[PDB]
Design a protein around this ligand. Sequence first.
Ligand SMILES: [Co+2]
Ligand SMILES: [Co+2]
Lengths: 141, 140
Amino acid sequence: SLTRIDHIGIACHDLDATVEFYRATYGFEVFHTEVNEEQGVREAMLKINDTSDGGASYLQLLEPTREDSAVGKWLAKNGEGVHHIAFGTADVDADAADIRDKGVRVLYDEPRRGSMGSRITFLHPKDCHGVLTELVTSAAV
Amino acid sequence: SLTRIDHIGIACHDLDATVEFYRATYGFEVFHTEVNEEQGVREAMLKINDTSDGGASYLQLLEPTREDSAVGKWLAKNGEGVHHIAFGTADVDADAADIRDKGVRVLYDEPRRGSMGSRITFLHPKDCHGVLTELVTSAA
Ligand SMILES: [Co+2]
Ligand SMILES: [Co+2]
């Protein structure tokens, strides 16, 4: 079951400049930063609030680490801005299987590693009225 | 201060078809629907979760009622997709004034009515690294 907005993915050319913009303008601190070599992105999560399902809502600021990354190619085409939205669930595997069975294109055959040890998958934006959509389960405890 | 993600604003050609997609695919349902002739939209709010500041987070699906709308013009140029993000605050007026004073332009000189009797304003996307950013104070 999708029970929260987990994050908004925001692509930027310069992660350190964009992080400083969110910090200086709104007072939002970096919760966690990491590099995902497989995706070719450096990410900063800014925690905005906690959620009623036990999770949290973040801004996920993303910079490409190389030209051949999905995010680097998206930025070259569209400029900086909102890249994707993410919904949280206790069961990414079951939800992804349910949505694939409805005919939605699921970009990965199985969930992959995401921010802070999460497991994630994506839905094709052309099946989601133009919105690149991520499904997220937080790290297991 | 900005204490939650209040909503994601998603522009679409056909609100009813888009709502059915979110209902059928994710099991979301419509919390509130309204026609706003000032903004020139029809909008549906789908409540996804409650938030730790006492508010809630929504998807806001927006269809144009006329082509001379911020949203109607944006769809012609961009196609369907994410149009804005919105942050909740207890005092939209105070936070907009503080943010203007930092050099980020505010699109309205005074806040306007938004969905569900909220009080809203927007920050200029070219001052926000390409993200059209709304500030929202919910009704009592
Ligand atoms: Co993400
Ligand atoms: Co809005």
